[PDB]
Amino acid sequence: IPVIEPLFTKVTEDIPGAEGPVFDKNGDFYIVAPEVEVNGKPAGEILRIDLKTGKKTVICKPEVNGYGGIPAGCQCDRDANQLFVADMRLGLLVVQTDGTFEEIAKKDSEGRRMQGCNDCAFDYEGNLWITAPAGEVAPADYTRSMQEKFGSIYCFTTDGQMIQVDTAFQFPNGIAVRHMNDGRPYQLIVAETPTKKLWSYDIKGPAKIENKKVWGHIPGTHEGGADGMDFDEDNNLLVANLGSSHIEVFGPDGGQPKMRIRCPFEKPSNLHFKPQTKTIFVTEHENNAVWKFEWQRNGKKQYCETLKFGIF
Ligand SMILES: [Ca+2]
Ligand SMILES: [Ca+2]
């Protein structure tokens, strides 16, 4: 497997559990620090990083009824400049740039208690596909599916429904949606970290996925595996293989990566493209820092980069 070694440039440092890199509709960059703790208890943070300097500002330190959150993944909304955040303790949150937030669901569409979330991906129809590797949200004692198969997948729909679309995953992690050239959502990709597998489903409609399949295989037997993921404009899927020192690049059809990206660290965690550029910001857990490097092309446009009232 061909490996490229592009130049990684430091962006910012000291972000405990540096995760969920995201750009909003204004080009502002954000990162979540899930692993920040206060006297042993969760106290995760949502930060805005000035790219010109690397200076950090925590806009939100989410807590519900005394229970601190573990914000781990992000997606920027389209119709409003707000961030949808997957929280390992609080479920799904919507955070405003002013730092205020709202817990989205205590329970799902079926009345079952919500599970902690880790990452999410907006399809072009506005539906949010979310991974839930943790057990029940706070106040429930924290648990996570790193060993046992209790990780679930949800689809938070445009009509406000938190629908569990699948269960029994061993730490569902990264997630991405593949679109047809005309913008129609047709395939969901979900990373199952420890098993070294990438799973795929056919998206038949909002919250409707079928034909579960082992779509791709992650290199290595190291502890870790597929974490964050995203598509480039040609639909190649770049996946952070935590513990491998590489970001795998899968072609449109999956299988084995067709190329690997060597990182100057062992734990790449998540990534995100800077809109309209080949620049990919990468978070890692070795130094708890954020970096950025140049990929071969622009990333696939995120939902926030699409237009509600566009003509073409
Ligand atoms: Ca993750
Ligand atoms: Ca991303």
From Swiss-Prot:
Tell me what the record says results from residue 19 to Q.
100% decrease in activity. Loss of calcium 1 binding
Effect on the protein of changing residue 217 to N: 3% increase in activity
EC number(s) of the enzyme? 3.8.2.2
Q: Which residues bind Ca(2+) 1?
A: 19, 118, 173, 227
Q: Per UniProt, what does mutating residue 285 to W do?
A: 44% decrease in activity
Q: Which cofactor does it need?
A: Ca(2+)
Binding positions for Ca(2+) 2 per the UniProt entry: 230, 271-272
The effect annotated for residue 312 to A is: 3% increase in activity
Key words, A-Z: Calcium, Hydrolase, Metal-binding
Role this protein plays: Biological function and substrate unknown. However, it is capable of acting on phosphorus anhydride bonds (such as phosphorus-halide and phosphorus-cyanide) in organophosphorus compounds (including nerve gases).
- Recorded protein name is Diisopropyl-fluorophosphatase
Q: What is the lineage of its organism?
A: Eukaryota, Metazoa, Spiralia, Lophotrochozoa, Mollusca
